[PDB]
Design a protein around this ligand. Structure first.
Ligand SMILES: Nc1ncnc2c1ncn2[C@H]1C[C@H](O)[C@@H](COP(=O)(O)O)O1
Ligand SMILES: Nc1ncnc2c1ncn2[C@H]1C[C@H](O)[C@@H](COP(=O)(O)O)O1
Ligand SMILES: Nc1ncnc2c1ncn2[C@H]1C[C@H](O)[C@@H](COP(=O)(O)O)O1
Lengths: 520, 520, 184, 122, 30
């Protein structure tokens, strides 16, 4: 598209309607972009002896980027409700990215007054990493996404990437990337940017919860025709009754003893924590007692491990040591905030397919029992994969991640984003943005010296993201009502999901996705 | 189909012929159906403090159901022989279900004499859960299948299902199902029911056993060109010979040391038991020492775990604690029967691909050996999955399960029924049956009270199930004869697989499927 | 459904008790006929369905109707000594007809009982038809009306016969499955 | 469990003809369907009697009945930002299941169910 | 409609005339 100065290069498209078979979410926000790194690429690295498991090496780029890898970027509270309460599952389909109404303001600090004006002849630069040649930095829960509330304005984040490193140093195999060596479209006021993307085939999310259990799958009325051993010694114990091999036919009575066809999902035990700050051990163990992995001799915390249940029945107070995603309430410092200032997510719908995160896995034998030796039991704390296991993945919440770029390696197992969502080989490419550097005043004499005197300026405009969603409708013969998400009809202070007395949108609680029931 | 009173609505089709490329099994049996639960749906649950790992909650339905998830339902002893001794593998293809010759008898207890007669104007109701909306209760080794012997008559089982539960109580997410809210076909005498189903693509079963081994796969004559370390210290030990690093080239001599390309299947150690009731420990450990898993804080016994070998060479007496399916002989109580009253199945054909169930898995290092530290070894009792592992699944026996409904979860690993058979996303749907309730005598005055006075009646008729089987023929260049299943030609008491002096069919032994040999 | 023989195959004149109540005086008749009713929402919607309906729609309304009677069986009972025996009288019939000309007093829509069971598995007894007329206390006026349902053409059914009926609702405003977020 | 329709009386005048108990007021509502067992004369005398017949064979009828109804729906079109209130079951650990049979087979409807859960403006 | 900077995107229409059968009222304000 190509138009003029006094002619808007786009309209405000923010709406969503339903097709019963699918739903299209249109979102528009206002963005602002500073000049990052002073038009410079900078080599960043770990502090000279400041930390060990946090060593790193990379670069800081003068470029910014757009992101909307949060569900609340596209769905409104209400829409999310309809979605959750009605559909077995859902998925992404298409994508439409649009940049418009661009304005480049240049600022000057004269005396003690900052004046801002229009630099019409100035441009901005956009390009999309569709060949996936730039390090994919999205899908890491970073901030700078689109505001949940449409009326809010946001600052466009800065691009920074990491590389292979040996402590504070780097290896010869490390990689340096210049985004200037990429063809980019430059835009003046009245120019716009267009982009269309098509999601790959990716399994529906589980917007459902099982009404049956793995162990409670059989028939309560009929007995099995299979036999198991339940008595090794205990006979008609009185006279001459040491031991005897006795077998029983499985019945509704021997419910946790019946033959089985399937196993629970894998596991990686997490430490149990209480929300009550006195049930816990009087010691600081969020690192020395937490489950972690290490690569290249570098410890890294296994935060959202395999999908495991948060708590067993009749507790609802013990959450796993970081066994789930925790969201921070609006207005709360990034450094050591209170327990009443965060929102911990409960994964208690997957109890029927998944092992409890804090609890064990089960029992394993590890000896040759006999008259000479007593049978030994081992408590299994870590279980790899097994032929016959079935599990449910995590959950997506209104403010959770949407997709994630599956790493390009030789092998993957069950490539679903650990933080939750859709694992994509080729995910919505990265869209870069940056203000074209404008040389300040040059000398009448020639200078070979690198240019570093530029006019200070920032850009602003609108951005629009349209996404189509395929839906999986609900087909259940459940007689009684199922559970639905709802607002408290009671007389209330402030309205859930709303601005306050001085204009600040706030998301009260996290929103699960599993409210509807399907069988096994 | 629609015909009259004195006109049979079907014929007795029970036969099987072969096509060399495939085999069609036709089976017909006579069935009888009572009135279950007194025309009532009943809420069933666990006894108030009777058991903990056996807590449950569900319902009992007035409906019955048809089942034939046993191989002996379709194959005769002889056919099974031909099948086993001739084919690399086999699988299900098509299905034909037919109900006919229905008769509704109503009984009356007058004085001390029960009279039974014909209620022609009475109906019966059938429907097939093809949308898979009713809890799949099949593939759980339940009883009530079709009689192995064609001449035998059977009682049609009752339908009962389980749901999500919190101890003896239920959760709000539990599900109540009414089979009356399903469209069903009602049949009078002379009406019949028809149904055709098509199996999905499912891998042939292993009707073979490997003639090679995982570790014995290489060449006995030639040496490897790869090198391994076999000596760390032991040198020309006499003078000044503490330690030296020495490597050897793999040879036929270093057979269990040669480089390898593959690993054995996964494992979950089981406890070792002896059939001799005196080799064992004088303690009752069929629960406190057996391998088990737990979900939602509920212990469940891992009965048929991963496919592991029952015993090592030169034993044939030590079977794993429930490491295999055990069948009960004809006429034997369901409660604590004798060892000479059950049939334990031996999985000793998969020795070459699978780890021994009772034995360990192997050795793992767990320390940094040095001059200061001695090398440490750990006996591995539990092994998840690994890149490079290869395993054989269990086995199907003449009286074993056929298929199993793979649970509808987010993830499965190697979705093969743990009890053995074909794992199906969409397995032969459930066919329901029930006698249409007939109101006894009503009052001349109107009553809003729930009706509970009915005429007592039971239904009877024939049922026919036709299944087509695709076969995988044998293509081996084995020179010497392979092992075949056969009857003892010796002078014998009773004939194997036959009725006795007073008319009772009995299956002597379990029948494996692996008699033919294929390489690796 | 199950249907007894009401009023002993007789039309009976019913009325208010001789001086038993004043605001409850009445005059009418009791008919040997029964009737079908489903003027309750739970007759058609399951708990779950009702949920979907309620939580999703601004409003709703009736459109079409299909009535079907089938699988009829006529059992005749005999009390011989101290034992009630029940058997089949195949050659016996039952009679159905639909007041489409609206000539019989409309007795539905009065919250009466005898509708279809909420739960599908439940069996119900078919209610009896009774109607009221103009009355002057315990007495009746000359303008009162006596109705005989036998003077209506009806279809008689033996075992194996069935009854069919289709109806089309008129234009009627959606119900308010909504609540106002604003006030007057 | 409320009434569905109601026959608007055939008078000279009506105001806002909506069933007071609630529902759809119909000029011509689903007609009444009558049913009755055809009277079967018991044993008759060999001699003629003009007397009204009153000796019948005692009998009752039984069978199935089917009612199919189509419902037109008005979909929801609201620009409400925050979530609206929805009907739901108590997810808590419970005794018996809402709207279900009990230990000896009796269906029971716990509470009445309103229809107004969604919000529209004025 | 789409035009430029130094080009008015509309005129001042404020008038009313009668048709005997009907009347059209045009009003413009700043
Ligand atoms: N989010 C997501 N993306 C893709 N696949 C998923 C996802 N979640 C579960 N799976 C499953 C579906 C396939 O059966 C399997 C393919 O694994 P592969 O390793 O590709 O053979 O992975
Ligand atoms: N009985 C049965 N049914 C289906 N598949 C089987 C069975 N036994 C083994 N497999 C194997 C065959 C496929 O390679 C794999 C698909 O796993 P998936 O998790 O589907 O990607 O599972
Ligand atoms: N249930 C029902 N049926 C019919 N009309 C209804 C109903 N509820 C409200 N109304 C209103 C709709 C029309 O504007 C008005 C016609 O009244 P009239 O007296 O017919 O002129 O009555």
């Amino acid at each position: 598209g190509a138009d003029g100065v006094g002619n808007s290069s786009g309209n405000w498209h923010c709406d969503s309607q339903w097709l019963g078979d699918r739903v299209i979410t249109t979102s528009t926000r206002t963005w602002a972009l500073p000049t990052y790194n002073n038009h410079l690429y900078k080599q960043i690295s770990s502090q000279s002896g400041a930390s060990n498991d946090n060593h790193y090496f990379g670069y800081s780029t003068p470029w910014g980027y757009f992101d909307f890898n949060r569900f609340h970027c596209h769905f409104s509270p209400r829409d999310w409700q309809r979605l959750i309460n009605n559909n077995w599952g859902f998925r992404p389909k298409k994508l439409s990215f649009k940049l418009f109404n661009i304005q480049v303001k240049e600022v000057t600090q004269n005396d003690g007054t900052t004046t801002i004006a229009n630099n019409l002849t100035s441009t901005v630069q956009v390009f999309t990493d569709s060949e996936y040649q730039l390090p994919y930095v999205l899908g890491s829960a970073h901030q700078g996404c689109l505001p949940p509330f449409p009326a809010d304005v946001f600052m466009v984040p800065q691009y920074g990437y990491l590389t292979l490193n040996n402590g504070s140093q780097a290896v010869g195999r490390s990689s340096f990337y210049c985004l200037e060596y990429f063809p980019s479209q430059m835009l003046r006021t009245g120019n716009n940017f267009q982009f269309s993307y098509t999601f790959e085939d990716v399994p529906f999310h589980s917007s459902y919860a099982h009404s049956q259990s793995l162990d409670r799958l059989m028939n309560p009325l009929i007995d099995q025709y299979l036999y198991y051993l339940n008595r090794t010694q205990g006979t008609t114990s009185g006279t001459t009754n040491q031991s005897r091999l006795l077998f029983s036919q499985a019945g509704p009575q021997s419910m946790s003893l019946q033959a089985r066809n399937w196993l629970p999902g894998p596991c990686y035990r997490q430490q149990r924590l209480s929300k009550t700050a006195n049930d816990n051990n009087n010691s600081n163990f969020p690192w020395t007692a937490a489950s972690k992995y290490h690569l290249n001799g570098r410890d890294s915390l296994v935060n959202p491990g395999p999908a495991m249940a948060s708590h067993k029945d009749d507790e609802e107070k013990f959450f796993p040591m970081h066994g789930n995603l925790i969201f921070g309430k609006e207005g709360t410092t990034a450094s050591n905030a209170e327990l009443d200032n965060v929102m911990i997510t409960d994964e208690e719908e997957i109890r029927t397919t998944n092992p409890v995160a804090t609890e064990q896995y089960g029992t394993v034998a590890n000896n040759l029992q006999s008259s000479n030796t007593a049978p030994t039991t081992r408590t299994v704390n870590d279980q790899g994969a097994l032929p016959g296991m079935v599990w449910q993945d995590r959950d997506v919440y209104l403010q959770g991640p949407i997709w994630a770029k599956i790493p390009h390696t030789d092998g993957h197992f069950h490539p679903s984003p650990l933080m939750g969502g859709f694992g994509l080989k080729h995910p919505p490419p990265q869209i870069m943005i940056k203000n074209t550097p404008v040389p300040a005043n040059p000398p009448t004499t020639f200078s070979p010296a690198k240019f570093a005197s530029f006019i200070t300026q920032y850009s602003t405009g609108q951005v629009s993201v349209e996404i189509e969603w395929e839906l999986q409708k609900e087909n259940s013969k459940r007689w009684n009502p199922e559970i639905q998400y709802t607002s408290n009809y009671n007389k209330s202070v402030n309205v859930d999901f709303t601005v306050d007395t001085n204009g600040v949108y706030s998301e009260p609680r996290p929103i699960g996705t599993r409210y509807l029931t399907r069988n096994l």
